[PDB]
């Protein structure tokens, strides 16, 4: 009830740092972003013991609800990090993008990247031949402040790119296609 009430009012971030079973597995479904730790965190309602007892299927703890499954195939986890220390370091960086509440404007931070510079690298990215793919990320990185881009679900639904970046100090969200 609180997680639903807070939706659209305050950001809700849930980082999974270990196994999660039963009803607990639904709170990340109500928050805004879910992150995991590779080979350490799990998300599933019932364990492999129930799957084997109910149906004639063979599965282990990583296959059923491991971080790799949820960041690559089911689309449940927004990103997995290698270990606990790196996971929290990236979480601090992610935090700095978001406002404290929905009543606040997108945060604006000190920026040294001139807002009026040109990016000549863009003129030749897009081929004239219609059947030749190009990497959309090259455009995104060249436009955003200081070439910093935070990519969400890098391994899931690769044909569309979404993520956070700053332009002239202000946090923006970026959505685009990946022709590759």
């Amino acid at each position: 009830l609180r997680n639903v009430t807070a939706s659209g009012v305050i950001p809700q971030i849930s980082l999974i740092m270990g196994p999660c079973a039963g009803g607990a597995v639904y709170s990340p479904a109500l928050t805004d972003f879910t992150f995991m730790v590779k080979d350490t965190s799990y998300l599933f309602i019932t364990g492999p013991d129930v799957v084997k007892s109910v149906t004639n299927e063979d599965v282990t703890q990583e296959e059923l609800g491991g971080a790799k499954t949820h960041t690559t195939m089911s689309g449940v986890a927004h990103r997995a990090f290698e270990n606990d220390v790196d996971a929290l370091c990236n979480l601090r960086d992610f935090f700095n993008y978001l406002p404290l509440s929905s009543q606040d404007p997108a945060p604006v931070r000190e920026c040294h990247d001139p807002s009026d510079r040109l990016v000549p690298e863009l003129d030749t990215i897009v081929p004239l031949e219609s059947t030749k793919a190009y990497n959309m990320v090259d455009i995104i990185h060249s436009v955003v402040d200081e070439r910093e881009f935070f990519e969400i679900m890098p391994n899931y639904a690769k044909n569309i790119i979404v993520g956070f970046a700053r332009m002239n100090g202000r946090t923006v969200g970026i959505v685009g296609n990946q022709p590759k």
């Binding site: 080979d39 270990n83 606990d84 220390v85 790196d86 370091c89 990236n90 601090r92 960086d93 700095n96 404290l100 509440s101 009543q103 606040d104 945060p107 604006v108 931070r109 000190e110 920026c111 040294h112 990247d113 001139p114 000549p120 690298e121 863009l122 003129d123 030749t124 990215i125 059947t131 030749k132 793919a133 090259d138 990185h141 060249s142 402040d145 200081e146 022709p179 590759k180």
Partner: protein, 668 residues
Amino acid sequence: KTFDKILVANRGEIACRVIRTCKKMGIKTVAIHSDVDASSVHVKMADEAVCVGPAPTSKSYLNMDAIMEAIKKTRAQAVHPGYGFLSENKEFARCLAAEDVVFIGPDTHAIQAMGDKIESKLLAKKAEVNTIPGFDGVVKDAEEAVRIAREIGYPVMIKASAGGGGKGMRIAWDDEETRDGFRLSSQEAASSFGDDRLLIEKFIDNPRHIEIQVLGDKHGNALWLNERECSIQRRNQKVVEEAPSIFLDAETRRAMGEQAVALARAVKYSSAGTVEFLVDSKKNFYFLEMNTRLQVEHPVTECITGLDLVQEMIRVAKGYPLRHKQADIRINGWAVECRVYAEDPYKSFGLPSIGRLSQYQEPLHLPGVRVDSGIQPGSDISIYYDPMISKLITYGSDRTEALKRMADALDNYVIRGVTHNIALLREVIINSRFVKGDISTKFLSDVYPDGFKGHMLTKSEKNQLLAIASSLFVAFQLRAQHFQENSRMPVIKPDIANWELSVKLHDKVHTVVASNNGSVFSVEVDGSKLNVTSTWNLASPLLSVSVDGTQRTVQCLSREAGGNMSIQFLGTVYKVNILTRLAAELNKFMLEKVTEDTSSVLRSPMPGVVVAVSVKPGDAVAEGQEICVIEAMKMQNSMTAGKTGTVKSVHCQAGDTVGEGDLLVELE
């Protein structure tokens, strides 16, 4: 006065050089390009351009028939091919002259005259240069090997009458090992390729490669310019050259310059070209070869002679005499040139890389620096062409000023998107043997007997690198806290007086404590006190810092939240992982799991039909090299290699249909 319109039959910086000179002269310049070179710099700089053909050069820059069509289509009067492609192609010059188009370069007589080694040696004998005699006969006896050497000279080489690759070769100096070398080769060589006839000739020790340039005149005149020292090379290609050698005094320069002219005036070489000499440790100069074409080492002599070679070649081709006399040619200072390639210097000294350029900034704000480049940001470098990026030329009043300015230009020279060879150039020019001049044509092979490893840091340099990396780390941490104030939710900046860091380099972990005093960070690195002062503009590709009075330029190439930073320091990229004290103390509890690097296994990223495979087993593969092209929903998904090597097996062929995850090619 001069030509109204000149066509250039080349691409890249050499085409740019001609376009700039023509514009200075008021001459319209026509460019040619392939379909992939349509956006290259020389195409945009030229006044008119004609597309000739597709990406491979054999159909675009060596297609003389398509070029002839472009020459007449634009009503060009003269053609300047630069170097490389059709500069020595006689059939091109013949069919070009047949149409009364002025060719800028050698005529076909000079090209054929030096066509082979026999005519070149005969010219050196007639022009009277050197070409040291050998033995015009077969050595048969045990005493002939030494008796003949006694009549001609001292350093004597024994080699097979025909063959190579060590086919009984030995180097001898005195008579005892000359006799021994012959009889060994004459009795064992018969067991290799069935031939035991030995010849003797004369050799030199630690050679230096020295060029002298000559400007020919159609009226019979010819002048010689200052020499070039071209000893730093890999895979028989030069990378660094110096103009005002060091191995010559005033008399030697005149003596050798006159001989280079004697060659040019005896074949009537009314063009610009180069004569190559080898000099031994005793300052004995021997003829090596005569070249007919503007060299790639012509932008370093110009900085000390004050000439413009392209301007002069165009007037000579029009029919004007040389504008100078020999008494006016002198050394006005010193100039050194470095060639920058898109190559990995670690992989057997220069393995080509493939890629696109995302950041590019030439050091043109520094004194005494001239950058001659054919690329612009958003340029691609590919397997079809020699991976040249630029030629960096630095000049000064003395040898130390030109070298110091070169070192500065290399650290302020931004190339990102490809792998480059700046680390190699930055270390060679500062090598104690290079500064003193003890350089031979095999210099790099003795300095780097196990390959290129990168710049090696000493104690003080490690302290400066640690202090810079630690201060830059904190500078980002402080910038992260400066928000516009939100009147609803006050933000309180943490009062962090000291930053306690654990800074891991290669295999060592250093203890660093930093504090901020405004623009300067006071950093203690394992007990050593350093003060790093800067403006700390964190967006610029070039960050200028002063560490205890020492001026450094560094580049931060990448940053991660986990503390990983990639910092280029003195040309070499160092990997440093900066954790806070707390993160480093707890990180020891993490399991050191290691995964497999399966970069040799190239699988299809997308279902569809295979339309091209660029390889067969044994083919060389560069990083980023296209291997396979798949075709689905009428597109051309290109699959590239992530590993340098050769192909071991090609599993899917063109015409085959593959799914997601199927194996296409397997590398060694």
